[PDB]
Design a protein around this ligand. Structure first.
Ligand code: NI
Length: 175
């Protein structure tokens, strides 16, 4: 029943702000946004290519009421300071010709659409590192089997998307 642990070994505080950084420093910086396709503002969730950037502060909220996050629980992830055209700060997974992608929405969202993430601890590490799972509807329910990874588009944006191989890994650094 381990609760999530941050980069300094302390429990992640529900609703608190954290920087989602890669385990391997060489993989880039924190998570932020980019404007792609026909988007009116930055509604595409991406990983900063700047290794010194901590990216945007992210709020992690649980499906359960608690001061902490029970790692086996579903979580919603949102930017503490979302772009202007986003209706709310929460990330969602949207279908596309290229496959499911992590985005921000112009629409108000129902809990079932944002409470679709789950952190999965990686065993081979001295600190607490987590892969990020996406959990689609197992209909009245939901199931966490599909991982989140990176896809660099033609312009160099490192978009967070559902991937088959090579899931990203993260450490949660309290802002
Ligand atoms: Ni690793």
């Amino acid at each position: 029943d381990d609760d999530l642990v941050d980069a300094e070994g302390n429990l992640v505080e529900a609703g608190g702000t954290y920087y989602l950084l890669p385990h391997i420093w060489a993989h880039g910086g924190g998570i932020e946004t980019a404007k792609t396709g026909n988007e009116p503002c930055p509604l595409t969730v991406v990983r900063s290519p700047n290794e010194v950037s901590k990216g945007e502060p992210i709020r992690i909220s649980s499906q359960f009421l608690s001061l902490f996050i029970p790692r086996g629980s579903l979580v919603a992830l949102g930017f503490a300071n979302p772009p202007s055209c986003a209706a709310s700060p929460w990330w969602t997974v949207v279908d596309s010709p290229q496959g499911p992608a992590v985005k921000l929405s112009q629409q108000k969202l129902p809990e079932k659409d944002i409470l679709v993430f789950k952190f999965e601890k990686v065993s081979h590490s001295n600190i607490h590192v987590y892969k990020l799972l996406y959990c689609q509807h197992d209909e009245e329910d939901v199931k966490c089997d599909q991982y989140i990874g990176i896809h660099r588009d033609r312009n160099g944006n490192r978009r967070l998307v559902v991937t088959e191989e090579n899931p990203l890994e993260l450490v949660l650094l309290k802002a």
